[PDB]
Write a protein that binds this ligand. Structure first.
Ligand SMILES: Nc1nc2c(ncn2[C@@H]2O[C@H](COP(=O)(O)OP(=O)(O)NP(=O)(O)O)[C@@H](O)[C@H]2O)c(=O)[nH]1
Ligand SMILES: [Ca+2]
Ligand SMILES: [Mg+2]
Ligand SMILES: [Mg+2]
Ligand SMILES: [Mg+2]
Length: 166
């Protein structure tokens, strides 16, 4: 069956693991355990196609980010995640996109910009700001909450739909 290799990247603490775990395991991880490099695999039907998602959950903490580029290298599509209550994580997106372009040696990599923790009210990144960033990259912006599940399936499936357009 069709396999899609997805890679989730972004600053430490933005909720990359919580998003992936909500998608794959249907629960919310409340605690914060920094990730090194974890992978998840699940068979799902997306738009009538049975496919296998291989999701690489990467480190956002600089300390844990050792061979991250070697992992990212294999990815077919990337979720670039920031948190809507973490302005620095949004500003950091530029450098993740540059890293993706570097590891794929392409200016045209399937990507979706994700603004996570949308269940929280300490918003410092407004939707329009993120929409504009994504527009400049030619990719979709989607807000999510790993806590409530809002947008979670949408984000990951939209990434599959972007890979399919390339
Ligand atoms: N309220 C809320 N909290 C969230 C959300 N997503 C993640 N969190 C919380 O944010 C903290 C960090 O989440 P985590 O998924 O571990 O972040 P990460 O990006 O994978 N961190 P790292 O890069 O170090 O591996 C956790 O305490 C988690 O519960 C969300 O959508 N809403
Ligand atoms: Ca929990
Ligand atoms: Mg993590
Ligand atoms: Mg390269
Ligand atoms: Mg502002």
């Amino acid at each position: 069956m069709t396999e899609y290799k997805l890679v989730v990247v972004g600053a430490g603490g933005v909720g990359k693991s919580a998003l992936t775990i909500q998608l794959i395991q249907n629960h919310f991880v409340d605690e914060y355990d920094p990730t090194i490099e974890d992978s998840y695999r699940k068979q799902v039907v997306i738009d009538g196609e049975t496919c296998l998602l291989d999701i690489l959950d990467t480190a956002g903490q600089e300390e844990y980010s050792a061979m991250r580029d070697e992992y990212m290298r294999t990815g077919e599509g990337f979720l670039c995640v920031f948190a809507i209550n973490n302005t620095k994580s949004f500003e950091d997106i530029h450098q993740y996109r540059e890293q993706i372009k570097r590891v794929k040696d392409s200016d045209d990599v399937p990507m979706v910009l994700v603004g996570n923790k949308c269940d929280l009210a300490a918003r410092t990144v407004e939707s329009r700001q993120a929409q504009d960033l994504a527009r400049s990259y030619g990719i979709p912006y989607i807000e999510t909450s790993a806590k409530t599940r809002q947008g979670v399936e949408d984000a990951f499936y939209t990434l599959v739909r972007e890979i399919r357009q390339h």
